[PDB]
RNA sequence: AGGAGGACACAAACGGCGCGCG
């Protein structure tokens, strides 16, 4: 459960891959990557180019 | 002879690593 939760408080993030940690409930919720700045603050917007 | 009867709808995603540009 703590590693569903907020993996990487754990004593070591468990991982699938070459040593990559899997990224927790609160991991998606923070962080730069995370919701807050990602999607919500900043959104890619149709009717738009460059 | 007479007479009688007789299927509609429906268009490609997510995480790393590297490089590069503003």
Do not use: E
């Not at 754990?10 to 991982?15: E, F, L, M």
């Amino acid at each position: 459960v703590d590693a569903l939760l907020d993996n990487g408080r754990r004593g070591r993030a468990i991982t699938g891959s070459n040593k990559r940690p899997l990224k927790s409930l609160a991991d998606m919720i923070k962080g730069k990557q995370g919701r807050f700045r990602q999607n919500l603050l900043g959104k890619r917007v149709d009717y738009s180019g460059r």
